[PDB]
Ligand binder design. Structure first.
Ligand SMILES: O=c1oc2cc(O)ccc2c2oc3ccc(O)c(CN4CCCCC4)c3c12
Length: 278
């Protein structure tokens, strides 16, 4: 995998012609190398490019990706796919591309499932979330995370909360590798980017590959992900939603054997698109 800006080449397209590329978008706290199992289950010579992390709200991230998508693929067709946060990013790009008159053929959400219940916007919720992260950081890094004063919780947005903790961490003098600090920073913000995403309507085909449940660690961070709606929270927004059950838990959906089901279904979709453009 070669990287150029925020674009990872997972399989380069031929010099000219060839099949429609699959554009995959990174998950919360990971890179697009996670899509290599999927690529192994897609038709031979299917190109694939991964869009890695950029800063901003979902819409601001899409505003950086959509111009690059068009630079690479022009009028279309567009195949946009993502697990975790990448599914929301793929969906946001599909909306932007459609608004610009581009040809989007397939949006693939790999268990990018909304919380079954609205997350309240209270200091109590912010507190519990940061204490759950403090517990995660102890079980994981055996490190003590500082806590934000209760009456300052609603004075800090997500970025500001993370900045507060990172500074107080370095001011506390705990030894944490910077590489872990940066992975933790992006994982926290990207998980919150899923939490706070506002889904816009999309008049187009979307396939939701739906696992059985979020895994325990996800539910420990935010228990409202223990509940799932049958449409994963997407039915009110998508005119043509196809829900493909894949079993397993959210963390397993990206890897074998669960990804074989995703690849088998997506390969048929890709074969139809290739036939349709020929
Ligand atoms: O799940 C997580 O893993 C992490 C793994 C890390 O290394 C670091 C941070 C986090 C992390 O910070 C979060 C903040 C809010 C929050 O709601 C969640 C739950 N997440 C929401 C999106 C859907 C799956 C569950 C997290 C979450």
């Amino acid at each position: 995998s070669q990287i150029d800006g925020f674009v990872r080449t997972l399989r380069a397209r031929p010099e000219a012609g060839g099949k429609v590329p699959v554009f995959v978008f990174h998950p919360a706290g990971g890179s697009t190398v996670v899509y290599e199992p999927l690529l192994g289950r897609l038709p031979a010579d299917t190109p694939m490019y991964g869009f890695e992390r950029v800063e901003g709200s979902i819409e601001e991230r899409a505003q950086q990706y959509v111009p690059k998508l068009i630079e690479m693929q022009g009028d279309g067709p567009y195949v946009l796919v993502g697990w975790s946060l990448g599914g929301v990013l793929a969906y946001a790009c599909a909306i932007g591309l459609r608004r610009l008159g581009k040809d989007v053929r397939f949006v693939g959400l790999i268990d990018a499932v909304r919380a079954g219940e609205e997350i309240p916007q209270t200091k109590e919720e912010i507190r519990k979330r940061w204490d759950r992260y403090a517990a995660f950081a102890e079980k994981t890094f055996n490190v003590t995370i500082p806590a934000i004063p209760y009456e300052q919780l609603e004075e800090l947005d997500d970025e500001g909360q993370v900045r507060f903790v990172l500074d107080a961490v370095s001011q506390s003098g705990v030894q944490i590798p910077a590489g872990i600090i940066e992975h933790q920073r992006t994982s926290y913000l990207d998980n919150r980017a899923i939490d706070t995403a506002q889904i816009q309507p999309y008049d187009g085909h979307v396939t939701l590959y739906m696992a059985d449940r979020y895994h325990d660690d996800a539910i420990m961070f935010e228990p409202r992900y223990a509940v799932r709606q049958p449409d994963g929270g997407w039915g009110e927004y998508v005119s043509d939603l196809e829900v493909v059950p894949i079993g397993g838990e959210h963390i397993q959906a990206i890897d074998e054997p669960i990804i074989a089901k995703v690849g088998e279904h997506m390969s048929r979709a890709l074969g139809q698109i290739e036939a349709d453009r020929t």
